[PDB]
Design a protein around this ligand. Structure first.
Ligand SMILES: CN1CCN(c2cccc(CN)c2)CC1
Ligand SMILES: [Ca+2]
Ligand SMILES: [Cl-]
Length: 223
């Protein structure tokens, strides 16, 4: 996250870190046994880390649980990042508590202008590299579909939306991928891609979760 702030320990209790010997992507806990993340985050041998604040220090509220299965969306296109969503099932159920909590799925799509909370352990510099140890947060509005498609002509599908600031300075960035965009208490977005981070007229692009609600509920009911 570039231009954000230190969330505070366990203040975003649905945020997970996906770890394959190191943190590589975020995700969001949607019930005790399932996480949703970005399909571009897929790899085998994922461990889900719940209850994290400093991802380099055991602070005492973590749960570490290996994934038993991964399910990439059937229409995910790695060329275009269309349908950039996957589900990960935990081998054992998370212990739900004030620090490890699920986030609800959207019952509908959010409007342009709705303020959202975006969070992660990705790079905090728009030029160069610095990765935080503690979780970083950003409040950012959903942008209109026209400003999103203007910013990235020929690349935005109906399964994507933009959020952020056209003036730059505040954005998600590398290592935030897969993590949550929460608006009105629902998971509306998954951090997906962009052109650099926090640059003018290049806001972040997010997978539009409200298009996937039926697929998520059907897929977890059958798995
Ligand atoms: C080479 N980078 C380019 C920018 N990427 C990125 C990843 C997530 C979110 C955003 C939104 N700013 C950008 C990471 C890979
Ligand atoms: Ca920790
Ligand atoms: Cl749907």
């Amino acid at each position: 996250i570039v231009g954000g702030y230190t969330c505070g320990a366990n203040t975003v209790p649905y945020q997970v870190s996906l770890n394959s010997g190191y943190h590589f992507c975020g995700g969001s806990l949607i019930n005790s046994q399932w996480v949703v993340s970005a399909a571009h985050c897929y790899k085998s041998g994922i461990q889900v880390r719940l209850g994290e604040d400093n991802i380099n220090v055991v602070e005492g509220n973590e749960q570490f649980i290996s994934a038993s299965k991964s399910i990439v969306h059937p229409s995910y296109n790695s060329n275009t990042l269309n349908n950039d969503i996957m589900l990960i099932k935990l081998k054992s159920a998370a212990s739900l508590n004030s620090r490890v909590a699920s986030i609800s799925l959207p019952t509908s799509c959010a409007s342009a202008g709705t303020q959202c909370l975006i969070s992660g352990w990705g790079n905090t510099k728009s030029s160069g590299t610095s990765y935080p140890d503690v979780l970083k947060c950003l409040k950012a509005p959903i942008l209109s579909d026209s400003s999103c498609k203007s910013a990235y002509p020929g690349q935005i599908t109906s399964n994507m939306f933009c959020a952020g600031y056209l003036e730059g300075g505040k954005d998600s960035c590398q290592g935030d991928s897969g993590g949550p965009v929460v608006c009105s208490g629902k998971l509306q977005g998954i951090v997906s891609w962009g052109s650099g981070c926090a640059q003018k007229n290049k806001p972040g692009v997010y997978t539009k979760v409200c298009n996937y609600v039926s697929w998520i509920k059907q897929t977890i009911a059958s798995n």
